[model samples]
Target: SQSMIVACRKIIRRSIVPLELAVEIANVACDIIRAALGRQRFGRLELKRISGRGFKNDEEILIGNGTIQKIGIWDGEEEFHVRCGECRGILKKSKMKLEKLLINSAKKEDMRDLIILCMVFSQDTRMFQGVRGEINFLNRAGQLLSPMYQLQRYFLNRSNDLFDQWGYEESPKASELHGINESMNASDYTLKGVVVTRNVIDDFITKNLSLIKRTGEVIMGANDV
Candidate 1:
């Protein structure tokens, strides 16, 4: 409903996702994404690296050592596996489920999603004369990409190399770092229109001009990066 920034300080690596998750795989995708941001910090190890002279006395680095690297696969007692479209047996079960829901009063908005899903999951469905298609995510994947930002995070300009140089300090705002800081003071700096425009000619000059007059000021630009 509302909007905010989502800048991170981490190296921004790893992580993954997939499509054909029209079924409960939607929940599976959400949990998978949510789990990434909440990786078990409770379990971490101090394992040393092979680097001979890394730090002053850095024996090891803190690496998360939890058994559960991902969520949604396990329901605490039972390990649940979400079936993808690529799997044949999975499609069969999905087809039956779709048949059952087809007759029932399923939400009509869900119609397009299921329709597109069948095209993606159809077995032996071939492209006639290079009319090719492949499995891909819809706008729903936008849901999967959103959990990291579900929590409050930093702004883009406030996380960078300069921040590191400043030693774990917050970086400046986008307005401070980029764009014009002149603030429409070109005339003030040049004094061109201190009393008149460009020249003090007779015919071109205005009838009257005030010394306390000010005009042509504007402000712009920002970054949600």
Candidate 2:
């Protein structure tokens, strides 16, 4: 029992404290671990936005960048590989892609809030939606097929630049002219980056919901409805 407790504590400590990753990213790390063990893949997804009013002719994008592997083949002798959804670039980043992080106790809670804030459009959402939409429109007559996956891939790649330009990040103060806590502290900054993401997505969805419905209808026929 003592050994078990020690092991459990070690895992919990190792899982979190080392990388100093945010809560959401930490969750993603956990999911990646589970997926790798299950011989699956993991990817990140984000939604894009445009200006309102004059930005009427606008669109949304999804960007996913991560790695996957081939498991359980040839007696499990095959190795894992990395694939960046950004440019669909396939590279061998690591055998396990499980680089751990050191935890920051002071900001751990705040870090987690950051992650959940971005969950609004992660790729996992599409997996569930894909199954749902497939079931809904798979066998219907004269229904247009849903292009969820294709659209997903398309947007995943397209949203990269936007993320670089606007996404909140954690790093050393010297990393950015507008440092995470530095810039905000030195000026009129207020709120965390997660707030920016949440607000942008909310505004984007609100302005484009009608267009989305219209495109979805055209893409999915009566059978697909």
Candidate 3:
């Protein structure tokens, strides 16, 4: 069997080299991650809102409109649905399939912001008290503060005037989805490193992932969000 070290080496040779020659880096990245992380653990692919005026509805917005507003997963493949975290509404639905665009038409800031939303809604699961030991996702039925990002200290630098402006009592339940209190501030963005063997990946996935599909035989891939 090829080793992790060997695989890591091949990552540059195979994935990176090929991607460098490709026009659609994000699409290539999605494929690479689906393989390397295993599709099951990689779960399903979904789209989140980037930067827009209010909200987009698939009903109103054309599928070919070039806006990445739909989210796809186990419920239905190929088709996409618009799930608004800010408004907590299903904006639209369509039979359209999302392909990685050959050119990244989105601004870097918008893409990063959308990626952050994806990390939570698509990938990360939530933990609750006794009701359900562990689960995935929280519905923003009433509370505000934007469910896109669960409240955390790492977000200290971002704007929070919405909280005071609205005069809400406490942070929304979405903040608790991360198992951390909303009080965490910018100073908590400190990093910690750990060294673990390959087996650790499975443990991490089982506890955190909604699905776990493996890439046939990964050579390597560009490694970042």
Candidate 4:
């Protein structure tokens, strides 16, 4: 437990991405752990978001980077070997298994909200209806499937750039440039304060949820719906 907590603190302090995006990345971590070791035992070891200055609880840990995995965790030596072997095998596959429990758990309305959240988080500026229309046309007319994993990946990568850009060009306070510094500070606060909706987050995680076999099998792919 101390190890996982220490791991979570390292993750949280990594400045990898904003906490909003890390939420889904942490879900991927949960999937990896739960699948390697049966969900029955490791299901309680899930990902959680902790707002403000504090540490995480027992059941959940932080992903830190928030959009990607910069660090990793495992149990003792035996479990570590098992998890590594399973992850290697899965990575070699063309498709991987998904956690149907989470995938099937998303509500219909939440799916729509998820799409909106993706667009907003990515700053696509297409608007909800426009984005939906474009997606439908592309998927139906062009036979292009926009899977959740790809969508999350796209948005997260963009998020990294945006967040960095927001903090770029920091200047020391000068009497002549006080207003400019204040304005930039306000902009940074707004960017940091952008809250991701819970429904949308749940929907994204459910759709992208992947699983593996106890015997180290890759049962699903990121492209899987």
Off by over 4 Å in 3: 1-10, 13-39, 43-70, 76-179, 182-225
For candidate 4, the per-residue lDDT at 197 reads 21
Assess the local accuracy of residue 100 in candidate 1 as a C-alpha lDDT between 0 and 100.
12
For each candidate, how many residue pairs have backbone atoms clashing (under 3 Å)? 0, 16, 13, 9
| CA RMSD (A), model 2 | 20.8
Provide C-alpha RMSD values for all models, in order: 32.0, 20.8, 18.1, 20.3
TM-score of 3: 0.21
- Reference-based TM-score of each model: 0.19, 0.18, 0.21, 0.21
Span of 10 residues, lowest total lDDT, candidate 4 = 85-94
Model 4 pairs whose backbones collide: 11-64, 21-66, 22-66, 95-220, 96-219, 96-220, 96-221, 97-219, 97-220
4-35 in candidate 4: lDDT tens per residue?
Answer: 65554343333132333334444533233343
- lDDT tens digits, residues 1-225, model 2? 556544433433333332222223335233323322331222232222221111111223222332121221111112222211221111111121211111121233333322222222222232222221112222212333233333333333333332333334443233222222322232233122321111111111111111113333221111110
Tens-digit lDDT track of model 3 for 68-186: 22232212222112221111111122122121111111233332232222223321122000011111233222222222222211122232321122121222233212111123221
Error of 2 at 6 (Å): 48
Note the Cα lDDT for every prediction shown.
0.17, 0.25, 0.24, 0.26
Task: List where candidate 1 sits over 4 angstroms from the true fold.
Answer: 1-29, 37-103, 126-225
Predicted structure with the largest lDDT when compared to the true one: 4
